[PDB]
Amino acid sequence: PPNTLFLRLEGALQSWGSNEAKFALRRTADAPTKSGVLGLLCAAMGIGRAEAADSWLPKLANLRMGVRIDRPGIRWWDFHTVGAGQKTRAETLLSRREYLADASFLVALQGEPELVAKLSAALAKPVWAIYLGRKSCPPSRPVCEHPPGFYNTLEEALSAVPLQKRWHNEPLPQILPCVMDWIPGYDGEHAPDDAEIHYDLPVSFQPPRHLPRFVIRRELVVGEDVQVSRETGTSVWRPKGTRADYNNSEYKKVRAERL
Amino acid sequence: VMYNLLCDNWVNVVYLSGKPDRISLVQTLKDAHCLQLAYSNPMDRFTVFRFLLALGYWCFANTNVEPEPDKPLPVSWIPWLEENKEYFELFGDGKRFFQADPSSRIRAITDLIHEIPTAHNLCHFKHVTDYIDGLCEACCIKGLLRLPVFTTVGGRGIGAGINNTPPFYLLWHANDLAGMLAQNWQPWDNMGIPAWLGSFQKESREVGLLAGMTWLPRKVYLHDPVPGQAACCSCGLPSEALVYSCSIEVEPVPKGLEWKDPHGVYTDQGKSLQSKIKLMSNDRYTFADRDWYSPLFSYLHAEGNSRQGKLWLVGFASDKAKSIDIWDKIIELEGTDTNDELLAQLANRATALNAMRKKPLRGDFKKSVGTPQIADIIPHAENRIAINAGKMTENRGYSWQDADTEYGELLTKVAYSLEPAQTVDARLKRGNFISRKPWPIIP
Amino acid sequence: MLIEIHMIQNHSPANLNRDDLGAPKTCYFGGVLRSRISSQCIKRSIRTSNDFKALAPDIALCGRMTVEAALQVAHAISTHIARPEIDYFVAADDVPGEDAGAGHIGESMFASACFYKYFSIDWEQLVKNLKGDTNLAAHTVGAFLLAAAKTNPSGKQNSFAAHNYPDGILVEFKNSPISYANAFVRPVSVVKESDLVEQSIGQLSNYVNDIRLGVIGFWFSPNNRYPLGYKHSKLASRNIGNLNELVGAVLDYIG
Amino acid sequence: MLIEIHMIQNHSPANLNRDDLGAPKTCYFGGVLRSRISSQCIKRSIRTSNDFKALLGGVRTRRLADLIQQEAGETECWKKAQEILNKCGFKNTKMLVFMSKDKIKDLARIVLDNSLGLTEAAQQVANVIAQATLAPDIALCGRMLEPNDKDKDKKVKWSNTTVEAALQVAHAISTHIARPEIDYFVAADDVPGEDAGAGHIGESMFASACFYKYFSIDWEQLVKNLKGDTNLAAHTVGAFLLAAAKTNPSGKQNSFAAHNYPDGILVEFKNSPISYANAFVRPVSVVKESDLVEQSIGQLSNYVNDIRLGYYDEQSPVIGFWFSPNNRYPLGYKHSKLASRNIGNLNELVGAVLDYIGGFKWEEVQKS
Ligand SMILES: [Mg+2]
């Protein structure tokens, strides 16, 4: 019955690299690419490099999905010096890598119910260590945090899941972007003028071959279709309390007992 | 085996219905309104579009019929590109495509492509090894089209391409292949002698466009081994027997040849305008982001000017043989006049960005690093600015003052780190840190 | 099953990781600027070390030419707002001349931070690339604990001798890989009656007090200097005062 | 084999180190401001200490041609020394060059003053400069040099100039919260006037704090740097201990004569360096009973007991000597009986650490 699976992508840093990066400058995209979430699910199931290639990509790729951007993390560039040789020689490889800092994403993959159930079961039981696109970016929130459900369209699924405040008084985005695989509608229906190309459909994964896809963005407005959640915890530590009083009734009984 | 560009599939496109496919030259020729060029490498996409533009120029030179817009290309181009079947051939007994005089020097197939690392002055690369894995036929063709456009220096001894070191490449973009070809159609009276004919006669200078856009600085023969590969491991698509190596020599580009590439961007002194990208944040350079701002003064003044359309920029940053980074960008444009000094100021944003980076917290010395924490927040503000690059360029409601106030929150939260005191003087110095912004400069 | 190690380490004023311009590496978290130590910095500091050097061990822990190493580390996000500082140096000519000063006369950068450091090991794949050597895998996990307990990033340390030790290690054997970086969305404000490390460990304790409400945990502080949870509540399964018995308890839990 | 020195030193109101604006150096540690003394200042004060004249053997100068010309009563050779240095790689009167003093004197006199070729003379000078690494201050502080490859000729090759430092010095951070103070000074005019005004008005900045000092010496690297002459290594270690205990940085000492001696030195012998500054993450607040050195020593003893009862190896026992003048400040006042050899004499402490190092006495090693 539940035809949608949900993924929560939040960490201190994250990096879903774009198409224009396998040189020494290795940038990132503003939203999780389809190959990134597909690889996360592939690790959650835990199949090999070529076992993904052997008839596993299009079963997860025909699942037209959406990615919902809660807060926009900023682009931080890390200065990475690869040692190259430390057969070996004193040469240092130079690189700069882009990361998304302080961003939270929700990815809703819509497909047939049994695949969604298997995906949620493998998400609760990751047979391999899963991360946020780069191995040095482990998640800060559970990827299987939000339970699966049944929804007719991607918009209903991505608007049903609430937006969680980390703390009590933080600025929330009044406008909330959502990026989805382009629904073709009826047969034919050439893509609209806002449909951008994105080379993130995997068909082989060693070496990575990516196929283009059409990607369309809508905007959601919080407070009418996306609702906030409770705080559900405490932030500051505030060590325990001194300053015993001298008028409460529980004081005088112990005071008289000690006498 | 016998491979032809006309019948065998080598072009990566995506159909507007949404089905990506590898298709041949005829398929992308006579459809031309249902597909869009889809290459993972941006400059591969630009080189394939340049080849298609040159083919359209040849078809117009031999048929004299303009491609009218919103309606696919004239149907007289296919029989003119069809009857010379032996002509666009990689194999066979006769003329060959982008191949030339006999050869002796042999180099691996990894250097024809640029995105995959080559045999440097090292032994280890980005998990590649020469003479073991090779490219497919489509990859070989798209690497051969990289030669007239994106050939760099080979250590100051090996010459560059026909348009010097590979400059910024600017063109007009549309959602369709018909709009791809139509928006970049402007021809010249003299066409030239392109290199898909045989050994062209040099004669005099002023080649035109068709000879200059397809200049061949390198050669390819390749020695075919007995059988070949079983499973591909370099391209990614598992294919049949592939290539292993090739043979590359150089041709010295002569002196003179007063010639301008239609899509290139040329400086005030006539030299090529480069992409200012390098990871090396030097004394005089501050690394921010893709430098869409750089090739704007020359292109919007001399070649193309103000025109309603999309501006696709391809920038292959290089320094001698160091392939630094390739990026592309799409800018909307209407052509609402041109303010001269403001667009000139926008043409070099890296100077003001480096000047803002070099200003220290408290100090007067000029060889200092300034504030290195600013250098990690300039990239994000530059990326936020670069989305509205069309409104920045035409100056409708976006200007230098309206876009550099996007640095404000990053400046506040960096000043919190740099002045971590709850005092009066720390707050005042934080406020002085807030108003820091890239004052523009005249050149 | 996954072994997760959350380490809180307060470092004395130094510069352990340098960017291109010589600044300490800096990240962005909790809506404030944090001091960062890169993951590969801690990886190479743990590797190539005689503290750790004492089928092939340490190839499975950190990979080398589809190994997919069992151990990976997160970027060390500080628990508080980063405080980068300028140090001004001169180098004397130490030969009597008519002038004074000869060196670079430049400025270096340094910062002191309390880092949260996340480590994750998969046990099953660590056994898998060790060809079923369970005892060797247990020994190399104990060696990881011994090294990462007492190895620091060997950055600029000749002029900044920062050799501080962690004051808190939490080891759990939970189901899904979770980082407690969300505990420090609050930067740690320092009060008069408590120190920075105690407040950071308390923030961690108040965050693991949640999640369970909506697995186990071994807590290590040197001689119970910092107890995880200043109460009698069932928050830490075993308060451990010494590192050797912590490693022994973890190993006998695993096998 | 690592020798670790942890010292607790209370200082009078003084300005030992200052930044550009003449303020005492401050750093944030544990979320609070701490008075800081730079490690380079301590290293310079140790190298220019009175317990180092018989051991100082290195010069770090850019005026090398002056040194080479100074060993010539009448042989005027300064432009040719400058030219051979300019072709050696320095670009000018040069960049800073560190090597031994007797080496530069004797070898540069017998090399560059010789009437001979020009490029290979520069190669000989470069070899002399690079190979002159036999000085214990160079062995401790460390050095590497890189000449300018543009001004250097293509026929000059340089060998390895990288001297690995065997000494690690931490910045002396205060055990309590930093107390920056302002001194309003005037300068009276010695001749009278009709106005009675000072010649100059300014504000000096000073701070009094209890500093924690940290030193680490790598014995294997020290005997690798100074080669097999272990007698000079023991002399270097003893001279370092005496200089660190008995010398203060030469800041504004003429106006702030703060020459207080440290009340506590822990010399520990271990294979892993330990920073006890985490003892003072919580700032030391004064109380009615005891003093600041006693409170700081108590906090340090608490952390030492916690570290020994925490990070401990049965294969490598931790062992250290505690210092107090005539046993004035004991370490383990309540329970921490860890210091086995509380020592109330500096020469006895030096003898004990030299005996642990090996069969060395201080009088025997004071001859290299
Ligand atoms: Mg390919």
What's the token pair of residue B390? 């069309």
Separation of CA A208 and ligand 1 centre (Å): 10
What's the token pair of residue D188? 């009276």
Q: How many CB pairs under 8 A join B and C?
A: 42
**Nearest neighbour of A141 by CB, restricted to C120, C175, C182:** C182
Check CB contact under 8 Å for B124 and A209. Answer: no
Residue D211, beta-bridge partner list: D9, D174
What residues have CB less than 8 Å from D314, skipping those under 6 apart?
none
What's the token pair of residue B329? 């960008």
Contacts of C33 in chain B (CB under 8 A): 373, 413-414, 416-417
The answer to whether residue A189 neighbours chain C at the CB level (below 8 Å) is no
Surface-to-core class of residue C198, CB atoms within 10 Å of its CB (0-12 exposed, 13-18 middle, 19+ buried): buried
Q: What are phi and psi of B259, to 5 degrees?
A: -155, 140
Residue D172 to residue D207: CA distance in whole angstroms: 13
Check CB contact under 8 Å for C203 and A137. Answer: no
Residue B443 to residue B393: CA distance in whole angstroms: 17
Residue C179 to residue C117: CA distance in whole angstroms: 9
Angle between helices B349-358 and B378-385 in degrees, nearest 10: 150
The answer to whether residue B383 neighbours chain A at the CB level (below 8 Å) is yes
Q: How many CB pairs under 8 A join B and D?
A: 4
Check CB contact under 8 Å for B362 and D20. Answer: yes
How do strand D181-187 and strand D200-206 relate by DSSP bridges?
A: antiparallel
Q: What is the DSSP string of C62-87?
A: S-------SEEE--EEESS----EEE
Check CB contact under 8 Å for B363 and D20. Answer: yes
The answer to whether residue D182 neighbours chain B at the CB level (below 8 Å) is no
Residue D121 to residue D155: CA distance in whole angstroms: 11
Q: How many CB pairs under 8 A join A and C?
A: 118
Among A117, A92, A88, A67, CA closest to A220: A67
Contacts of C17 in chain B (CB under 8 A): none
Residue B29 to residue B18: CA distance in whole angstroms: 19
What residues have CB less than 8 Å from B2, skipping those under 6 apart?
B89, B91, B92
Residue D34 to residue D17: CA distance in whole angstroms: 13
Residue C184 to residue B224: CA distance in whole angstroms: 62
Residue A108 to residue A179: CA distance in whole angstroms: 11
Check CB contact under 8 Å for C2 and A129. Answer: yes
Residue A17 to residue A26: CA distance in whole angstroms: 7
- CA neighbours closer than 13 Å in the CB half-sphere of residue B377: 25
User: Going by beta carbons, is chain D in contact with chain A, meaning 3 or more pairs sit under 8 Å apart?
Assistant: no
Residue D224 to residue D218: CA distance in whole angstroms: 10
B235 marked among binding-site residues: yes
Contacts of C165 in chain D (CB under 8 A): 274-275, 278, 307, 310-311
Q: How many Å separate Cα A179 from the centre of its chain? A: 13
Residue A45 to residue A34: CA distance in whole angstroms: 16
B123 marked among binding-site residues: no
Contacts of D61 in chain C (CB under 8 A): 93-95, 102
List the subunits that have 3+ CB pairs under 8 angstroms with C: A, B, D
What Å distances lie between residue B202 and B211, B254, B256, CA to CA? 10, 10, 13
CB B15 within 8 A of CB B299: no
What Å distances lie between residue C79 and A102, C75, C199, CA to CA? 14, 12, 9
CB B380 within 8 A of CB A76: yes
How many angstroms separate the CA of residue B249 from the nearest CA in chain D? 30
Angle at CA of residue B74, ends B73 and B76, nearest 5° = 135
**Nearest neighbour of B40 by CB, restricted to A184, A204, A210:** A210
Angle at CA of residue D30, ends D243 and A141, nearest 5° = 135
CB A67 within 8 A of CB A107: yes
The answer to whether residue A133 neighbours chain C at the CB level (below 8 Å) is no
CB C128 within 8 A of CB C21: no
Surface-to-core class of residue D174, CB atoms within 10 Å of its CB (0-12 exposed, 13-18 middle, 19+ buried): buried
Q: What is the DSSP string of D313-338?
A: -SSS--EEEEB-GGG-S-S-SSS---
- Using DSSP's 3-state secondary structure scheme, residue B133 falls into coil
Residue C164 to residue D282: CA distance in whole angstroms: 15
CB C163 within 8 A of CB C14: no
The answer to whether residue A232 neighbours chain C at the CB level (below 8 Å) is yes
CB B72 within 8 A of CB B178: yes
Report the 10 Å Cβ neighbour count for C148. Answer: 24
Residue D348 to residue D325: CA distance in whole angstroms: 12
Residue B286 to residue B280: CA distance in whole angstroms: 8
- CA neighbours closer than 13 Å in the CB half-sphere of residue B227: 5
Residue A163 to residue A226: CA distance in whole angstroms: 7
What's the token pair of residue C188? 């740690």
Residue A80 to residue D102: CA distance in whole angstroms: 44
Which amino acid, one-letter code, is at A50? A
Residue D97, beta-bridge partner list: D61
Angle at CA of residue B436, ends A100 and A29, nearest 5° = 15
User: Going by beta carbons, is chain C in contact with chain D, meaning 3 or more pairs sit under 8 Å apart?
Assistant: yes
Taking CA–CA distances from C31, the nearest residue in chain B reads B413
In the block, tokens 């020195």 appear at D5
Check CB contact under 8 Å for A166 and C214. Answer: no
B34 marked among binding-site residues: no
What Å distances lie between residue A176 and A37, A224, A255, B323, B408, CA to CA? 20, 12, 60, 38, 22
Q: What are phi and psi of A139, to 5 degrees?
A: -70, 150
Which amino acid, one-letter code, is at D290? S
How many angstroms separate the CA of residue A156 from the nearest CA in chain B? 24
Surface-to-core class of residue A94, CB atoms within 10 Å of its CB (0-12 exposed, 13-18 middle, 19+ buried): middle
CB D313 within 8 A of CB C47: no
Taking CA–CA distances from B365, the nearest residue in chain D reads D20
Farthest-apart Cα atoms in chain D, separation:
80
What residues have CB less than 8 Å from B208, skipping those under 6 apart?
B188, B190, B191, B192, B259
Number of H helices, E strands in chain A: 6, 10
Report the 10 Å Cβ neighbour count for B3. Answer: 17
Contacts of C26 in chain B (CB under 8 A): 373, 376, 417
Check CB contact under 8 Å for C125 and A128. Answer: yes
Residue C212 to residue C220: CA distance in whole angstroms: 20
What Å distances lie between residue A146 and A7, A9, A159, A194, B352, CA to CA? 7, 11, 13, 31, 46
Which amino acid, one-letter code, is at B221? Y
CB B295 within 8 A of CB B345: no
Which amino acid, one-letter code, is at B143? G
Residue A232 to residue A230: CA distance in whole angstroms: 6
Residue D76 to residue B247: CA distance in whole angstroms: 63
Q: Is C200 left (phi over 0), alpha (psi -120 to 50) or beta?
A: alpha
Report the 10 Å Cβ neighbour count for B296. Answer: 26
**DSSP H or E run through D82:** helix D79-88
Which amino acid, one-letter code, is at C36? R
